[model samples]
Target: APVRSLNCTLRDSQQKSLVMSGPYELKALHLQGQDMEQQVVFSMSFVQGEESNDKIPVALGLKEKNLYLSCVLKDDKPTLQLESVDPKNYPKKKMEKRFVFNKIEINNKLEFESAQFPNWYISTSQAENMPVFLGGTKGGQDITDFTMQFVS
Candidate 1:
């Protein structure tokens, strides 16, 4: 409904923070003795107009700015990547579909289902340090639910 920003850490049921490594590589890391450097903070921008009855269209970016989590097809499979985006005019940008996610909120937990792939969600592995990937209920179980701890 409204465009807004949230500076927060995405944590899974195990309480591991979503961490980024090697540009766009996403993995889960436990908060190590107050070392928050690897626990990436997502500066999410919720876009307007594309909301469904229950989900909000959103752009997931890093607190550092410009770097958005984009969904792309590689070898005919949906994949998540990091790319630069103009958040203000995101709807008109080329292939903006890749940058948009349907954020379904369940209490404090959030599920980001890809706009391009209806059931494919932005998910983390139950195992620590595993790469973040997309899948659905029919696929093997992954940690698709996350809680956003607001920082700003």
Candidate 2:
């Protein structure tokens, strides 16, 4: 993904450009890395333009930078919502259950891990571009396989 231009068309794998899909922001991905680290990460609710201003309230960076993806702790659990961050930064209030930006394990995208729950990873249980959730398993190959995928 390049630095998004407002006038350009956004197309899918089938080359289908859905309308209002915002020639706006890069809707999903907490991209971390420099030319040295050489990394790009995919998270849910990728943000780029002004399109999804409040949809994805957070994005991620790494140790090289000050901001990483922190969680929005609302109740007994941690939730990723329109509260963790603003268009610029997550306020000084911070959070309780911040998920760590970890390795690029599959398909060249990184995965998220929480310090609170070491066994789980942030994953979406639905179809393409749907809402994401936390999926748990005891380290089974078939289970973590979705571990998901990146598009062609």
Candidate 3:
């Protein structure tokens, strides 16, 4: 992917902000970080609107892996899980129970989504800073409405 960077902060449906981080970077990086290197994780970057093969070197993963975030169908529903398969063990990298994410949009104002279920988005739970899934209204509004902000 292209060498790029972004500074951001996240929040839930209510718009309360937070310094969010997660184990979203791929395996090549998963076990390479030292305590200091083990700083902030969980981030992805793309064109305002981009494609995997539309040319621009891409934004997320690498030439070997592309994007870090992938989809795993759980009982046939899009789980939108994070995965970083080790090339050493997984060679084929085929798709069956797992699939690739087409595109992603953030700061749609504290939520996340995937092509499999455009109407559904993931958010932090009211109880804690934990992810909880919720679907949008038919009009693509309401239902766990949230927003993320650029801290820079």
Candidate 4:
């Protein structure tokens, strides 16, 4: 059988604005360019505001420009709670795993600059080879194609 895969990306519309907020849903069919029978892995990335940077080890590495948001299966889609501001000022953080935004604030009309959707590998005995996918969305609609290379 031929192996197939799918990936996706997202972006915000406002550029100068701060704090991008929204809810997104990903389904199995949304995984594009692959056959249905193939097992699927989902990956995500995002940029948190400066306030968040002070609390967490924002630096994954020098090359880690974006944040590794989440990983999930097609059947069990993960929920993304993005907050472009500090949690002390927000009430939602008390109840959920909030993506705090120290650099930006809510109602700032910020936009999603860029996003990436990378492929995941699954193995039986050992690990399988994973391919990283990159892309971005505009105004939460227009999606642009991007490229990412894996390094060892």
Candidate 5:
């Protein structure tokens, strides 16, 4: 299947913003101190719109598996809940997902401050930083210069 692209504008409740262009996806997750050689344990996709009527679709895909975990924005933040767990695995793990929109850059030069991740609790390090590249795999340099659009 072809990858579905969606345009989204990320804005913070405080009015900060980041506009995302086409061909975007929730590729992978990385830790601050983790090595780049290792693969990202979790991955997701940007599903255009909502799973239900009157909602937007931002689905999560684990690894290369075909099964995708569906998600939605609650109060302007993308959230994923653990619906079920394997019987063999004790001590289930759950995570509260959040997306932090950094900034929008045109051709790696021009930049616009738009609100993206409204609810993300950015740390001191990432507070003023912008996401230049989309991390598809672990340990990759951030990509700069991309176009963004907002979906109502």
Candidate 6:
């Protein structure tokens, strides 16, 4: 297969990297200050963008598994949904269920803007162990700005 699977860690300025909380949730865990001893690795399966943008859209998933990130409505509020789907069989027609995110690089780091939501970005919390969220504004941008360090 000629598919490129990106193995990397998403980290914030505080040195917190995203860790899978359970099978469905992502929590920012600060594992040792700046040391890479126990940082969780995430594998991003890139899908070719059908749009006109130059950024690569990806189906973000955990390494060694098939779970994909999805944000959906629960009780009238947008909630995180982690569902299983093989990257090879990624839905090309259903825009609603696509775990796609447009990658926007900023100062060598990456900022992921939701393909389904305009201007909304994936973000981590300043407080450790907090769940990830999507927020507006670039000031809240630091947390959303991930230093995507490639492991391979």
lDDT of each: 0.76, 0.32, 0.38, 0.23, 0.29, 0.70
Model 4 ranges off by over 4 Å = 1-74, 80-96, 99-152
Compared to the true structure, candidate 6 yields what TM-score? Answer: 0.78
- What clash count goes with each model? 0, 7, 5, 12, 23, 0
**How does model 5 fare in lDDT?**
0.29
| Candidate 3: stretches off by over 4 Å | 1-5, 15-42, 47-67, 85-111, 134-143
Across 19-87, the per-residue lDDT of candidate 3 in tens digits comes to 224544221111122532432233334333224432221122322442344555668665545566664
lDDT of 2 by residue, 1-152 (tens): 32211111222222222211122112222222342122223333233322232222223332123333444455766553322234354222232345332322445333444444554544433233333334354243312222323322
**Span of ten consecutive residues with least summed lDDT in model 5:** 117-126
Model 3, C-alpha of 38: deviation from truth (Å): 12
lDDT tens digits, residue span 109-132, model 6: 777877766676788888878887
Stretch of 10 with least lDDT, candidate 3: 24-33
Pairs that clash in candidate 3? 13-145, 13-146, 109-146, 109-147, 110-147
Give all TM-scores, in the order shown: 0.83, 0.35, 0.44, 0.17, 0.23, 0.78
- lDDT by residue (30-86, candidate 1, tens digit) is 776667667888877776436876788877788866688888888988888888767
Model 1 spans with C-alpha error above 4 angstroms: 1-3, 86-95
Report the lDDT tens digits of candidate 5 across residue range 1-152: 43343334323222223321222322222323333223222232333321333223243333333332223455754442223324343111222232212232333332221123332221111232333232222222332223223343
State which candidate, 2 or 6, has the greater lDDT: 6
lDDT of 2 at 98: 57
Q: By lDDT, is 1 or 6 better?
A: 1
lDDT for position 33 in model 2: 35
Better of 1 and 4 by TM-score: 1
Highest-TM-score candidate: 1
Candidate 4 vs candidate 6: which has greater lDDT?
A: 6
- Alpha-carbon shift of residue 96 in model 2 (angstroms): 8.1
lDDT of 3: 0.38
The superposed Cα distance between candidate 3 and the true structure at residue 56, in angstroms, equals 16
